[PDB]
Amino acid sequence: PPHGELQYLGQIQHILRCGVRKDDRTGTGTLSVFGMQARYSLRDEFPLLTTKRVFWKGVLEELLWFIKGSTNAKELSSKGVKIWDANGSRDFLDSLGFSTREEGDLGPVYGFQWRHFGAEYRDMESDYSGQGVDQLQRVIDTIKTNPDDRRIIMCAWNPRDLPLMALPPCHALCQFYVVNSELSCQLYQRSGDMGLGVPFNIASYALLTYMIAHITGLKPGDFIHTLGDAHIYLNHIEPLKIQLQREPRPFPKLRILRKVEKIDDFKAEDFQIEGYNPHPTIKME
Amino acid sequence: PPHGELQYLGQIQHILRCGVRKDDRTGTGTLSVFGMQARYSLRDEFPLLTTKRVFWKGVLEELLWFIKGSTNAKELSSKGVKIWDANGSRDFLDSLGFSTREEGDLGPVYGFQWRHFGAEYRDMESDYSGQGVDQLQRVIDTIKTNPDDRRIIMCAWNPRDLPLMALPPCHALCQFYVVNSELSCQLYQRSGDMGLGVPFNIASYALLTYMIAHITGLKPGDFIHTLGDAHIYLNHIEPLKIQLQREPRPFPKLRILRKVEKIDDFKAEDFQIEGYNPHPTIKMEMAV
Ligand SMILES: O=c1ccn([C@H]2C[C@H](O)[C@@H](COP(=O)(O)O)O2)c(=O)[nH]1
Ligand SMILES: O=c1ccn([C@H]2C[C@H](O)[C@@H](COP(=O)(O)O)O2)c(=O)[nH]1
């Protein structure tokens, strides 16, 4: 009765067996399935994949960067995490018509949507204090005062702001749920590169759930990963096949090293991944 | 090939067996599971549930009402479909603090969000032409010009407008997908009353997919139903146990009776459900 990492590997196998050939904007080509769902227990385990090493430092720094409301790729890059740098480049920005935008200015992406949904975006340096909807703090407040609420949603998909963004968000929304003192999170991810993006994305939302569980005095329950276009790039098939034959090691644990009161107060040094024993990195695309 | 409706019935059985007690605002109580997903083929079949009769006229008129951009419960009620009337009443509006709102004015709900996302909501009578994002038409245009696009989303969840709405939307967003000339749709439904709401909601989004497939010259593929809080109200347990004893009948077909060019041009008489053979209606009392 597959659990943990086997859910992810079962998804890869399903796409290899049942996915259909489908081109993408890059003309690379994929095998693709529309609509998948996996459940990862968070109960005394943290779903950082072991069949290939996941970029944990990237996961953690990106999430803290989102939490601070930043839309400046330079602020993430300064932490040694370069994953958004190409989308903030001078050439890239110009290709989108944003010639007067300063380098690094991703537009109203995750950070802005999460803390200031509906505010008027100006640039990455503007003071947005008190503007728009602080969905992250509202989620936290609702969990505290009305844990049964069926509307605990944080939504990054903002149709009005899409044309200003460097890239449209893949993580369109997430929803939280509480029962029996456990906090669960479901992510709606519209588009998933199973080889390169998805392991990172699972660890991101499991981490967010651990953070909010910590702040609200609850235990982490499940992370439910829902995909729209779940795809494997054709040039990832052979590497993933090698990966698929590797035995998972038990998932590590995540420790939070002090009592933290407010979501904005977490720092990277507050977190420790314990007993992570991955098989070596597998290079993909 | 098992009947598609067995997925819905398997979800009910799972919640009865493994759902946990979870209270709601009405103090009715539910059994609840978080995170479920079912896939309903749309290929030469229409998933209108047969183990109890679904209110098809409600499904179809509500959808046409969303398409027109309406936020006026009276405009749906005039078609004989009363499902939003309690939420537009003077009493319900006043309970939310909207004492100066006109009766019927649901606020910036589905219709507004789908056709005018991001516009400033005034009232249900205002002219919003050209204001906000027409997500419904943009979805149609993208399917036509770039069917591989992985961003074909229509989103009703608008955090800025939530406090103005009569009810926050259960159907937070949907996404479309095209491959092999087939159009699929996935619904993210944050909250599902499995007894009373879900059968209706499946028919709504399958109907929307048939409509857009027709407009864009594609065949309907799959409807993927994803749930957040999937729940059975405690007072629905005994009726659902009766329902669970029924064998599904083969699903009907949906016929579209003329060639329609624009989503706004569909009329109720354009649609015919063929070979629907449900078991009788099962009464389930709505929470509050
Ligand atoms: O966090 C992320 C960001 C991007 N992608 C993937 C999916 C696609 O392969 C590509 C995004 O391209 P589009 O879906 O926007 O076309 O990157 C992910 O898996 N996770
Ligand atoms: O289209 C709809 C509208 C509502 N409901 C249900 C789910 C809940 O039982 C209730 C709405 O309550 P909240 O989720 O907002 O608490 O009605 C549905 O299943 N489908």
Polypeptide structure, described:
The structure is a homodimer. The first copy, chain A, is 29% helix and 22% strand. The first copy, chain A, is α+β, with helices and mostly antiparallel strands. In chain A, the strands form 2 sheets. Chain A has a 6-stranded mixed sheet with strand order 1-2-6-5-4-3. Chain A is globular and about 50 Å long. Chain A contains 8 helices and 8 strands. Chain A has a single domain (1-285), classed as Thymidylate synthase/dCMP hydroxymethylase domain (Thymidylate Synthase, Chain A), CATH 3.30.572. The interface between A and B is large, with 43 and 44 residues. The structure holds 2'-deoxyuridine 5'-monophosphate (2 copies). The site of one 2'-deoxyuridine 5'-monophosphate (UMP) has 8 residues of chain B, from strand 5 and helix 8. The site of one 2'-deoxyuridine 5'-monophosphate has 8 residues of chain B, from strand 5 and helix 8.
Pick out its properties.
alpha+beta; binds 2'-deoxyuridine 5'-monophosphate; Thymidylate synthase; dimeric; transferase; homodimer; methyltransferase; 285 residues; EC 2.1.1.45; Thymidylate Synthase, Chain A; six-stranded mixed sheet
